[PDB]
């Protein structure tokens, strides 16, 4: 059982998600700044949720748990970016709403037992993702550029990372078993695991290493 690729990617994801959470926790201790504290709480919670979900997949070894974790973590990563650029509640609510639709229709697309329609839900989900990325790349950038150099600089990096990593999911889904079934399950599980760690631990490392989180 431990020799199967699928199990190995799940075990690795659990380990990396666990180590990241602990590292962020260590880094977070001995930080008094009120604003910085908020970023550490959100950013530490993200990989902690994923750790639990990846652990749950191992214990049950199914992937219905990945969507549940995407459902919880995607909104939190958006809040992180929203806090960084001091976005207004209205735009935040719109982002989370679009995000809920994105995750929700994605799951519906994977549950449908009638082909052709798989792509209909994928198109709706991808459209929702595109609205979010549009808001992040064109809307948040303007607000960030009118702010402190450190904030503007870290946001652009997090922005570029988010747009590229998130855009990869629809692609992997389409070539994977939920879509056209071109790439085997173990390769897809690997692609998602790599994307998940990069989008959470990777993203969190860049954010938490920056002075942009401090109130100043």
Curated annotation (Swiss-Prot):
Membrane topology (Cytoplasmic): 27-40, 81-91, 139-156
Q: Which Pfam families match?
A: Bac_rhodopsin
Q: Which ranges make up the Extracellular topological domains here?
A: 1-6, 112-118, 176-187
Q: Which PROSITE patterns match?
A: BACTERIAL_OPSIN_1, BACTERIAL_OPSIN_RET
> Which positions, given as ranges, span the membrane?
7-26, 41-59, 64-80, 92-111, 119-138, 157-175, 188-207
Q: Where is this site: Primary proton acceptor?
A: 69
Post-translational modifications? The covalent binding of retinal to the apoprotein, bacterioopsin, generates bacteriorhodopsin.
- InterPro entries on file: Arc/bac/fun_rhodopsins (IPR001425), Rhodopsin_retinal_BS (IPR018229)
Q: Which residues carry this modification: N6-(retinylidene)lysine?
A: 200
Q: Which controlled-vocabulary keywords does the entry list?
A: Cell membrane, Chromophore, Hydrogen ion transport, Ion transport, Membrane, Photoreceptor protein, Pyrrolidone carboxylic acid, Receptor, Retinal protein, Sensory transduction, Transmembrane, Transmembrane helix, Transport
Biological process, per Gene Ontology: phototransduction; proton transmembrane transport
UniProt GO molecular function: light-driven active monoatomic ion transmembrane transporter activity; monoatomic ion channel activity; photoreceptor activity
Task: List the subcellular locations.
Answer: Cell membrane
**Membrane-topology annotation of the record:** Multi-pass membrane protein
What's the main place this protein lives?
membrane
Any one annotated GO CC term: plasma membrane
Function in brief: Light-driven proton pump.
Q: Share what the entry says about its subunit structure, partners included.
A: Homotrimer.
The UniProt similarity line reads: Belongs to the archaeal/bacterial/fungal opsin family.
Stated name of the protein: Bacteriorhodopsin
State the organism of origin: Halobacterium salinarum (strain ATCC 700922 / JCM 11081 / NRC-1) (Halobacterium halobium)
Instruction: Give the source lineage, highest ranks first.
Output: Archaea, Methanobacteriati, Methanobacteriota, Stenosarchaea group, Halobacteria
